[PDB]
Swiss-Prot record:
GO terms for biological process: apoptotic signaling pathway; brain development; cellular response to dexamethasone stimulus; cellular response to interleukin-1; chromatin remodeling; DNA methylation-dependent constitutive heterochromatin formation; embryonic skeletal system morphogenesis; hemopoiesis. Component of a PRC1-like complex. Identified in a PRC1-like HPRC-H complex with CBX2, CBX4, CBX8, PHC1, PHC2, PHC3 RING1 and RNF2. Interacts with RNF2/RING2. Interacts with RING1. Part of a complex that contains RNF2, UB2D3 and BMI1, where RNF2 and BMI1 form a tight heterodimer, and UB2D3 interacts only with RNF2. The complex composed of RNF2, UB2D3 and BMI1 binds nucleosomes, and has activity only with nucleosomal histone H2A. Interacts with CBX7 and CBX8. Interacts with SPOP. Part of a complex consisting of BMI1, CUL3 and SPOP. Interacts with E4F1. Interacts with PHC2. Component of a Polycomb group (PcG) multiprotein PRC1-like complex, a complex class required to maintain the transcriptionally repressive state of many genes, including Hox genes, throughout development. PcG PRC1 complex acts via chromatin remodeling and modification of histones; it mediates monoubiquitination of histone H2A 'Lys-119', rendering chromatin heritably changed in its expressibility. The complex composed of RNF2, UB2D3 and BMI1 binds nucleosomes, and has activity only with nucleosomal histone H2A. One of its GO terms (molecular function) is promoter-specific chromatin binding. Induction: Down-regulated by oxidative stress. It is found in: Nucleus; Cytoplasm. This is Polycomb complex protein BMI-1.
Length: 145
């Protein structure tokens, strides 16, 4: 639902409200197949992307304003070819949010921006992501000069 297509070089990625484990099969909670022997780049990586939480003032939305439907989740989700780079993502954001060249975009894992050559695999290997959930990315804009 609510999935949108954008092209970034070397593959087309579709991003939006990806189905959640809650609605997915409960069997996916158990010991799913996984193997560090697999180093292929013909692989799909699941991830999220949200605006770095600077405007949240270090406050939790659900904490201050708990919803009865529990609809607090400021991300967009992405099934993405693992070969894709930070450079591609920033472009995709640049295009999605219509971001002028007047600003820079930092793509970050936690607080730390990532180099534009990093592949999504490189990130999973660097940060030792364990395929528990999507790879959580963040982003932010800065004036350039």
């Amino acid at each position: 639902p609510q999935i949108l297509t954008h092209v970034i070089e070397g593959f087309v990625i579709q991003e939006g409200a990806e189905p959640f484990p809650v609605g997915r099969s409960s069997l996916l909670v158990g010991n799913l197949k996984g193997d560090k022997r697999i180093i292929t780049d013909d692989e799909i990586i699941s991830l999220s992307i949200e605006f770095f939480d600077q405007n949240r003032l270090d406050r939790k939305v659900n904490k201050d304003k708990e919803k009865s439907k529990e609809e607090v989740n400021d991300k967009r989700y992405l099934r993405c070819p693992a070969a894709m780079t930070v450079m591609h993502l920033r472009k995709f954001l640049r295009s999605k949010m219509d971001i002028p060249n007047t600003f820079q975009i930092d793509v970050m894992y936690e607080e730390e921006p990532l180099k534009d050559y990093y592949t999504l695999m490189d990130i999973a290997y660097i940060y030792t992501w364990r395929r528990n959930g999507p790879l959580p990315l963040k982003y932010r804009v800065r004036p350039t000069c």
